[PDB]
Amino acid sequence: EVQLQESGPGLVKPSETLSLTCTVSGFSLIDYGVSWIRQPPGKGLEWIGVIWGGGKIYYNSVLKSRVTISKDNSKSQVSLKLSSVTAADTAVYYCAKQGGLLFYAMDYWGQGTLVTVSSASTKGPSVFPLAPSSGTAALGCLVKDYFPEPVTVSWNSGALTSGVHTFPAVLQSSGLYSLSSVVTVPSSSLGTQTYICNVNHKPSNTKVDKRVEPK
Amino acid sequence: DIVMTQSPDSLAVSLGERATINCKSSQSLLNTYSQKNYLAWYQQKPGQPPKLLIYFASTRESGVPDRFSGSGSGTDFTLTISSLQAEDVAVYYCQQHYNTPFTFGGGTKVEIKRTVAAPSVFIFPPSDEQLKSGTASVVCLLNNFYPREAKVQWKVDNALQSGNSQESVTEQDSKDSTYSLSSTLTLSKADYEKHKVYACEVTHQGLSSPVTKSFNRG
Amino acid sequence: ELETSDVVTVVLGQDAKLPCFYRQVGQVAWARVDAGEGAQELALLHSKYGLHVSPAYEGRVEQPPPPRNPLDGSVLLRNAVQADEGEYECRVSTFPAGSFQARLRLRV
Questions:
Q1: Which alpha helices (H) appear in chain B, and where do they start and end?
Q2: CA B36, C60, C108, A60 torsion-angle sign
Q3: CB pairs under 8 A between B and C
Q4: CA-derived radius of gyration, chain B
Q5: Residues of the domain holding B134
Q6: Do residues A9 and A113 share a domain?
Q7: Any S-S bridges, and between which cysteines (chain C)?
Q8: A71 backbone dihedrals φ, ψ, rounded to 5°
Q9: Scanning every residue of chain C, which has its alpha carbon at the shortest distance from the alpha carbon of A62?
């Protein structure tokens, strides 16, 4: 019942201001406090600040002078606004509920949101089937040339999950991302069970269903 | 600002064995009056929000299996997953919740030592569509292997290539503590028209010696 | 308005009474507002759940014996330490009608 949803702009121009919002639900934001944590991609967690149920806001020393937390007890809404967003502000931002009244361990967390401070646009992915080209055969898509991250590859409408590997995207010399997703499956299955990678790139509102097919 | 220094940075243990992830604080996290030590261990498994494990150094949280028996006091604390069943392959962060600004430590990534496993090498040739687009990306897939260490070579037309490749290793499956890698060779369509045979030579500890998977432009 | 003596003085080893009387108060909070390092919450007398002292004061902070409520947000900082010395601030967040705050000093 204690659910935190974090939604905000994903791609932010350098020198701008991020403005994610955390719609808490099921717990009274009047009593409990929510803090914001960020985790720079592939790095340690960082604390941004806590907005205690009485509206007292505590900010980390480092990101202070550039952050603002506030809430609306009425709409169960908490919000982050970070100024001068610059290279280093890229990360997955998180809002978590403090465990108890004046307790500093964050019991319930939010799923996250990758804010990407960057100068590029939201180009969409180009799904190029990596044919099974036939034990365990392998078929996969090559989401390519997309920005920014992340892209959600899924197979056969979320049903096919066993043997799936979606790899971390890499940043190409072009400044665009490229990701592969593959799902080794029975040899005979290639013939019947259809496989259709479902690719979503939210920043560009791109949704692609591509059918990877033998030969 | 209490500085929390976890140690070691990375840890490898077999399935049954104990794991210990010490953590240190520039300041004691002890209230003599209360005889409580306030340090919380989290568990940021791959691609998920951190999950508290143990508050008050020892007091776990409903649901956390007993294997995660946290302990320690003062500035020296310790998490102990008694038997590191595979799913417990996440990064564990120690947080001081003694005062603000809350501070987490680096995180000790834990891992699992299964024995060696040889990779599955599949070579996927450039599809017609990407060829029409003017780009050809050749991908090489190593389906399951341990240890993480692996090397793929991209020999284009019996000619070794380099600097036109990027590798990606998926994290250690919680099913069987095995990794999977994929390497990409990107050429102009023209280059794909300058050569016929493309090959992926990989040498893994498990593989007695290099296996080379290959195709032709035709 | 919140009623608080501007200055509070406690000799070592005494239960300094931090006063905060409002003229119903939904919750009172006390904090040590001094500096960047000295910016710590001290206790939260929430009317519906009680007192919830912070991790560094769980023992030296307790509210006056019953029945002092309503509208008494007093909290006593006993066995005061020379360091305890510092400006604090109550926030009496009166509901169904709004919010407030008052400073104070403790000079051990």
A1: 128-133, 189-192
A2: positive
A3: 24
A4: 23
A5: 121-216
A6: yes
A7: 20-90
A8: -140, 170
A9: C36
